[PDB]
């Protein structure tokens, strides 16, 4: 509960090695009870068998010293993947977590073409201003189109909408004064956000 | 508990019939909406531990801190948690991923 | 290559709805040039060049009917000038800043600030039927495409 | 001629004459300005849902503390029944309502003009301290 | 500082890296083109 | 139309490691664009270069 005793720790500590048996137990017996290249076979049960692995292996490493352990995390993050028992039964989670790993496949395309389009947006606006934010002022701008990381950033802001409309009209009002040819920055942001 | 006089459109709105099953379909899967927030916020608690016990490093809570951020984080105002932030400084960015991958993971 | 072509041809048998959006997104604006012709112009520079507000508040005319503008400062002074836009762009004169000002305020962002910025410089309670018919419409809109 | 040029918005009016050489999508609004059969339904129940929800924030919300550049102003006054609908409406669409949510604490002095108001305790009386959940049940409602 | 006999440690200060880039890149497309060329003549000569 | 030769041979390159290096190009064309460090106007400090 994120307190930091250590009376209670130190028994915090040796249960979570029993554990590791309690989560063996049945492994060995679906090695016996079950057929060798069968149990091992399922595309769910293979991953238990990585995962309770990965902890036994995880808890033998820090056991002893190691830089940046991440150990517990790893461990309780393994012990949420035990709820994942819990989703074999109750169905109405499984095909839903199931359906989520089949899409990311097919969205794998539409997330690269959407970064693409972001890249060559992002590479149009800094060729387009590419550090002609003066605004003749001193205060910080929020956003600025000088480096490539800022001008991403400032892009994905932009088309996220979010005060986007200040954004274009200090990018107009930069070299493009209003009158008849100083609105010819302010499409290039009607377009992106569209 | 002053001018609860308006139970006429009560009595007049169950004519058509075909909303009374929407709000029983609704009112069944409440259970089940309810058990997806308490297991994703289990894992925001698991994920909350894990941040705040290795960074976040003091100089409310690890299962309601993300949740009363969440309040002024739905979508509008997370782009203004990143627009005060682009000024501890970069100690941990990686929540705000979080908060992103939560809310992917909501959304 | 197969699903940006699929991408631009969904996109094409929508495109007359698109369409119809551009005379909505004139339509209104034509409203605002008959009913917000320069009403900005009217500020409330205090003594030269500078308002008597710190530079957040509209300086709403000093109408002949007061109610809005009042301008209380203790000496005030309400000349002609450009105290609207924080760079003078989405005032309702110069027909194309009318058209981006509109589109600002079609795409859900920001359009309380117009509105309240014209309810104080013209009046209150008048204009806001107009919004609201622009929002509704709007919304009408998206649910269509 | 104000608020009688109506003419000269009957020339945009034939603007929308354009409209009537777009048959082929006329039908389209044919199937949606006509399809005002099972809308009524839920139009009323959207407007019962402002009605009660927006006669229950006036003696909640009483007293409402219009000042000049505190975000709660003339403009976003609530006493007024039609400000009041203006303002739940602008809340409904999202439009930055956090800052609306912000703008209600229990320590926030409302109007301090009733005479049982002179601060001899240091209390503010407005709480207000509700409106959050309530205006999330309600944008969640008006979603849904 | 002098030199008397033409700084043979250091390597000269005009040296044109780009040349060597692209003629690096010139010599690995004239093998692919050529090694495909070859290919082809034997696969057509092998079939009349 | 002119296939005795060269039109023959000339379409026979279209290996796949022709269109990987082409990509290749590509990507190396986007990564030279990516950094192009900007100047107010003509800063020739050897890279624009």
């Known amino acids: 509960h994120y307190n930091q005793p250590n009376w209670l720790t130190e028994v915090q500590d040796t249960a979570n090695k029993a554990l590791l048996a309690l989560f063996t137990a ?49 461990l309780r993050c393994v012990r949420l ?75 994905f802001q ?21 009158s008849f040819p100083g609105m010819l920055v302010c499409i290039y942001f009607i377009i992106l956000f569209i | 508990l002053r001018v609860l006089r308006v139970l006429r459109p009560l009595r007049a709105i169950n004519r058509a019939k075909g909303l009374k099953h929407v709000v029983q379909c609704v009112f069944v899967a409440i259970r089940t909406i309810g058990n997806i927030v ?70 | ?22 005379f909505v997104i004139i339509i209104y604006a034509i409203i605002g040039l008959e009913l917000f012709m ?14 008597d507000v710190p530079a957040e508040d509209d300086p709403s005319p000093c109408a002949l009917e007061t109610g809005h503008g009042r301008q209380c400062q203790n000496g005030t002074v309400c000349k002609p000038g450009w105290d609207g ?51 509704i419409i709007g919304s009408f809109f998206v649910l269509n495409l | 001629r104000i608020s009688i040029t109506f003419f000269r918005l009957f020339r945009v009016m034939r603007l929308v004459k354009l409209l009537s050489r777009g048959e082929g999508i006329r039908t389209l609004l044919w ?60 809340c409904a669409t999202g439009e930055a309502w956090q800052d609306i949510m912000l703008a209600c604490m229990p320590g926030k002095k409302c109007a301090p003009e009733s005479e049982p108001s002179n601060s001899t305790e240091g209390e503010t009386p407005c709480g207000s301290s509700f409106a959050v959940f309530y205006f999330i049940s309600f944008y969640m409602l008006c979603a849904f | 500082r002098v030199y008397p006999s033409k700084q043979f440690d250091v390597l000269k200060d005009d040296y044109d890296y780009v040349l060597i880039s692209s003629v690096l890149f010139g010599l690995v497309f004239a093998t692919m083109i050529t090694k495909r060329l070859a290919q082809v003549k034997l696969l057509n000569r092998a079939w009349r | 139309l002119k296939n005795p030769i060269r039109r023959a041979c000339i379409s026979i390159v279209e290996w796949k490691p022709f269109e990987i290096i082409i990509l290749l190009t590509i990507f190396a064309n986007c990564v030279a664009l990516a950094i192009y460090i900007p100047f107010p106007e003509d800063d020739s400090n050897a890279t624009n270069s």
């Open chain 4, 31 to 90: 199937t949606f300005i006509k399809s005002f059969q099972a809308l009524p339904y839920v139009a009323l129940l959207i407007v019962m849902l402002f009605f009660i929800y927006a006669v229950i924030g006036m003696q909640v919300f009483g007293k409402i503390a219009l000042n000049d550049t505190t975000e709660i102003n003339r403009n976003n006054n609530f006493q007024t029944f039609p400000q009041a609908v203006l303002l739940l409406f602008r």
């Open chain 1, 158 to 178: 932009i088309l996220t909408g979010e005060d986007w409309n200040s954004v274009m009209y200090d990018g107009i009002m930069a070299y493009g004064g209003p």
């Open chain 1, 26 to 74: 049945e492994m060995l017996l679906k090695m016996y009870s079950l057929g060798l290249q069968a149990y091992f076979v399922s595309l769910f049960n293979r991953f238990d068998c990585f995962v309770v692995c990965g902890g036994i292996l995880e808890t033998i490493l820090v056991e002893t010293k190691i830089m940046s352990p991440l150990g517990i995390s790893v």
């Open chain 3, 85 to 135: 836009p924080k760079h003078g762009i989405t005032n309702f004169d110069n027909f194309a800043f009318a058209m981006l000002t509109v589109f600002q305020c079609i795409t859900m962002e920001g359009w309380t600030d117009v509105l309240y910025w014209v309810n104080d410089a013209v009046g209150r309670d008048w204009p806001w039927i107009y919004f609201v018919t622009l929002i």
């Open chain 2, 38 to 107: 308490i297991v994703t916020t289990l894992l925001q608690f698991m994920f909350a531990c894990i941040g705040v016990q290795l960074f976040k490093g003091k100089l409310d809570n690890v299962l309601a801190a993300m949740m009363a951020l969440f309040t002024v984080s739905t979508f509008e105002g997370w782009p203004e948690l990143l627009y005060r932030s682009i000024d501890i400084y970069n100690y941990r960015v990686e929540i705000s991923i979080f908060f992103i991958i939560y809310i992917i993971i909501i959304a």
């Open chain 3, 38 to 51: 320069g009403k900005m112009h009217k500020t409330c520079y205090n003594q030269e060049g500078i308002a």
């Open chain 1, 81 to 155: 993947l035990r709820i994942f028992k819990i989703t074999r039964y109750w169905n109405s989670l499984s095909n839903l977590v199931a359906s989520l790993l089949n899409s990311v496949r097919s969205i794998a395309s539409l997330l690269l073409l959407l970064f693409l389009f972001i890249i060559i947006f992002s590479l149009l606006g800094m060729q387009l201003f590419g550090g002609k934010f003066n605004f003749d002022e001193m205060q910080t701008r929020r956003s600025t189109f000088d480096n490539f990381p800022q001008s991403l950033l400032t892009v």
């Open chain 3, 1 to 22: 290559q197969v699903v940006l072509n699929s991408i631009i041809k969904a996109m094409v048998p929508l495109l007359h709805i698109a369409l119809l959006v551009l």
